Design a protein around this ligand. Structure first.
Ligand SMILES: CC(=O)SCCNC(=O)CCNC(=O)[C@H](O)C(C)(C)COP(=O)(O)OP(=O)(O)OC[C@H]1O[C@@H](n2cnc3c(N)ncnc32)[C@H](O)[C@@H]1OP(=O)(O)O
Length: 273
């Protein structure tokens, strides 16, 4: 009698192996897989069951308001309390790739911003980031995740950039919840670096900390840490600034050479509560 662990999830054409254990309320059997509907995120122990529900009539995108939509991606804002089932399913899926995550069942305190890529086939959920409706620490992100099958395609940086656009619209600085996984922290460091580098080349050769946080919603701490890492911190005109140098120009051009997609602030149709 085999009592197997969940060793693989079948999502669309993808067969993904979890990185960590997730509390799916499922029976342990001699099989080690479950089906995850790429639209509803519902889990099924049998292909037949999955098929049975797949036929049902359902929207083909996350259950929320589309507050951002460009030719590349869309962002849906979902209130956990309004979509408990879907969000709980999202959290169970997310935990498979997180060392730790708050109780998956309690989604009420969060707002989920799910990003989809649109094809000739429609919407495809590629990642998301949750956010406390009320954060005592002012965290502008709780967990952020790019589904495994879509990682290392630039989606994570888009998720992060979007979280800062919300903060900017809110007229507040923000920073991701600590502690961050290594993957998460390294992604933020790259984003913060790319951001200061782009500002120095496209905005001004010299910029004060205040100006930076005002334009990016990045906190003083994240700005200083990033500036020190790049060796671009100085004192000019009576205050601390970051400055441009050949290294930064080089980095900027290399960044641009990758012709990466970015978020257009003008397409964010959203008002904070
Ligand atoms: C806040 C918190 O509670 S934190 C927890 C953070 N989340 C996790 O740990 C969950 C598991 N991990 C993940 O979901 C992901 O690893 C994340 C979100 C941390 C990062 O997401 P990703 O989609 O992989 O990010 P992204 O692709 O933008 O990262 C850039 C990397 O992709 C590579 N890349 C992007 N597009 C391309 C492309 N077209 N061709 C080749 N490489 C590419 C970059 O070269 C870079 O590699 P590098 O980091 O060694 O320099």
């Amino acid at each position: 009698a085999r009592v197997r662990n969940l060793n693989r999830i079948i999502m669309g054409k993808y067969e993904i192996e979890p990185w960590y254990f997730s509390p799916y309320p499922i029976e342990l059997t001699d099989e080690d897989f479950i089906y995850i509907d790429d639209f509803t995120l519902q889990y099924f122990g049998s292909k037949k069951q999955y098929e049975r529900y797949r036929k049902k009539c359902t929207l083909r995108h996350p259950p929320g308001n589309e507050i951002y939509r460009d030719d590349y991606v869309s962002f849906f804002e979902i209130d956990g309390r309004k979509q408990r089932t879907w969000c709980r399913n999202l959290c169970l899926l997310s935990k498979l790739f997180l060392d730790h995550k708050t109780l998956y069942y309690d989604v009420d305190p969060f707002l989920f911003y799910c990003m989809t890529r649109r094809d000739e086939l429609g919407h495809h959920l590629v990642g998301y980031f949750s956010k406390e409706k009320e954060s005592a620490d002012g965290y502008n992100v709780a967990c952020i995740l790019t589904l495994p099958q879509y990682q290392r395609m630039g989606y994570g940086k888009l998720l992060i950039e979007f979280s800062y656009e919300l903060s900017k619209k809110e007229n507040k600085v923000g920073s991701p919840q600590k502690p961050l996984s290594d993957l998460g922290l390294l992604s933020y460091r790259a984003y913060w670096s790319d951001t200061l580098i782009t500002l120095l080349v496209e905005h001004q050769k010299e910029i004060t900390i205040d100006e930076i946080s005002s334009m990016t919603s990045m906190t003083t701490t994240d700005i200083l840490h990033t500036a020190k890492t790049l060796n671009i911190l100085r004192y000019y005109k009576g205050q601390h600034i970051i400055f441009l140098n050949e290294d930064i120009l080089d980095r900027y051009n290399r960044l641009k050479a990758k012709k990466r997609r970015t978020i257009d602030p003008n397409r964010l149709i959203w008002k904070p509560p």
